[PDB]
Design a protein around this nucleic acid. Sequence first.
DNA 1: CCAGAACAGTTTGTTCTG
DNA 2: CCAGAACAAACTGTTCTG
Lengths: 76, 78
Amino acid sequence: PQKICLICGDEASGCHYGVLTCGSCKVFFKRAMEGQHNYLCAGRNDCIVDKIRRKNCPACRLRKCCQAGMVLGGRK
Amino acid sequence: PQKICLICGDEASGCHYGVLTCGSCKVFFKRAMEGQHNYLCAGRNDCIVDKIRRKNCPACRLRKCCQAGMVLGGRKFK
DNA sequence: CCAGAACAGTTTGTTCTG
DNA sequence: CCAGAACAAACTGTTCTG
Ligand SMILES: [Zn+2]
Ligand SMILES: [Zn+2]
Ligand SMILES: [Zn+2]
Ligand SMILES: [Zn+2]
């Protein structure tokens, strides 16, 4: 039918850092946790994270990753 | 003495399309108005437009541009 | 000076590799 | 199959031109 990324609703590529996600949320999460960016939502931590706008709010996209269960860790 | 962009609060470069802006807002405004995309704010049409985050929500940045008085035009003469 | 164009750096996303 | 690396397209911002 089609695997859907639990972060953004794009087509998922596989189970990454614990969660069914697309390729972009995969690198995103990795890059976000890794560098210290201190991302702050410019709205109210409310943002819809979807395919077209996922890059809009890194704070909300990262928060969604963390709530979906994504966890850092290199090749289990 | 430093001139402040009225859209994002960065340092302003001049008066562009009718208001005090930085060069990034200047082009953003023209690209946005001429592009094929009517941006949909993923929040509440409320977003803060400041230097670090101006890129975050093009819908709200464009809204802020238009509300500030920015208007498309060609190269006008005095 | 400022709009538009051209150029350039930054960012996000996709394909390659072990 | 999946992390991480290498690659690449897309997007945002800066310097050049009339
Ligand atoms: Zn995704
Ligand atoms: Zn947000
Ligand atoms: Zn600005
Ligand atoms: Zn917004």
